[PDB]
Design a protein around this ligand. Structure first.
Ligand code: GPS
Ligand code: GPS
Lengths: 217, 217
């Protein structure tokens, strides 16, 4: 089958695992473990980093026969093309493009905070910024059922993940945004998703590696 | 015409300024200035950030008729689709997907180094990771004229920019990789490119804002 490699955390790989399940892909996973502080040993990965034939070795990676991919967005697009889960008109394409990239930004902002030695003192400032990020997603989605238009596309998988993470981080963050709360429930409502969430494979937390200041164990 | 908005620095917009020229696009730019220390006023932008009707306001932005786009990668792909500068086959799409995302990683690595107060401190070590970064681009490219394959595609504008930047940072970083040096000369040799580099509109430095520790002026 296809091999997905990543750390044994949700990290930035949730969308992929979700999309592999949604599409009924036949895949196996390799979940590398990181050791504990203070050294946070990475040897399980490092032992094979340069042995897998990857052009730009990194995690996550996807091996699909002779096809070897790295970079999460490139893996997401590869599986989207295979399964017809890309936008179909220019307008959906542009919406898809923007959201892909915007998710990445919002993901990096969370990371910078959670790996900041000053997490606890930085936290208050970060919180204040949340309602503005969510408003932008709320107004972008509006009354559409999904981010790109009328049909699920790979970008709903990225959007779900990041909205779900901010929601774990600040549970009351979606209170003001009905259509967001509704998008979460709709997504989780998809038959394949629903069934995966009850599976042995489901990995929602920790979100971050042991190095982080939040959701690290 | 189209409007490109961004700071008056090369930043991460080089690839879009290059592509507008290559495609002979009719564009004007709004180059925002940041005031100087100690408050580095961003008011010129901030006064209109939410008045442009962008979905997720940011810089760069492109306005193209009724289309309004943010996210540099999204602007790049929009222009690529508009001018047929995308990969044509599955192998070329995958190669483009990976490179697009890898360039962003290598970009963030540089930015992250350049915005650290401990810059001078960190240079040395950063300087040793370079050989390995270049080697990967070099092997990936191999004997091909362009990164996706047989034809110039938008990712070549991305690859050009980051190899250019690394080369400004470490003038000798490419002596070991002649195919990369050849790629820089072939890109710069493109007709519309050459003319742009001698024009008043060309902005190859500074790279970073006044905030930065290198290429900040
Ligand atoms: N742009 C690329 C990003 C590739 C990359 O940096 N990968 C990390 C793991 S991803 C990492 C992470 C590691 C552990 C736990 C969490 C994270 C995480 C979470 C959210 C967002 C970013 C992160 C990141 O901090 C990794 O360990 N790489 C193998 C290595 O360096 O040898 C992508 O989109 O695919
Ligand atoms: N992922 C997005 C990124 C959008 C974004 O963060 N833009 C920065 C300017 S880009 C910035 C920069 C500002 C000044 C000088 C240099 C940089 C820079 C250079 C290289 C790489 C990244 C950077 C960045 O540090 C900004 O000032 N935004 C307006 C605002 O937030 O209100 C994209 O790909 O387009």
């Amino acid at each position: 089958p296809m091999i997905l490699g990543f750390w044994n955390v949700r990290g930035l790989t949730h969308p992929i695992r979700l999309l592999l399940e949604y599409t009924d892909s036949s895949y196996e996973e390799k979940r590398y473990a990181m050791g504990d502080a203070p050294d946070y040993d990475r040897s399980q990965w490092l032992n094979e980093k340069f042995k897998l034939g990857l052009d730009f070795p990194n995690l996550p990676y996807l091996i699909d026969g002779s096809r070897k991919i790295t970079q999460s967005n490139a893996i997401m697009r590869y599986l989207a093309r295979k399964h017809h889960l890309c936008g179909e008109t220019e307008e959906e394409r542009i919406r898809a493009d923007i959201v892909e990239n915007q998710v990445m930004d919002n993901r990096m902002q969370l990371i910078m905070l959670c790996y900041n030695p000053d997490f606890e003192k930085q936290k208050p400032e970060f919180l204040k910024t949340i309602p503005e990020k969510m408003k932008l997603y709320s107004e972008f989605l509006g009354k559409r059922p999904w981010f790109a238009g009328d049909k699920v596309t790979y970008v709903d998988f990225l959007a779900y993940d990041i909205l779900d993470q901010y929601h774990i981080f600040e549970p009351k963050c979606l209170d003001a945004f009905p259509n967001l709360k509704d998008f979460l429930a709709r997504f989780e409502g998809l038959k394949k998703i629903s069934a995966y969430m009850k599976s042995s494979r489901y990995l929602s937390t920790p979100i971050f590696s042991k190095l982080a200041q939040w959701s690290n164990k």
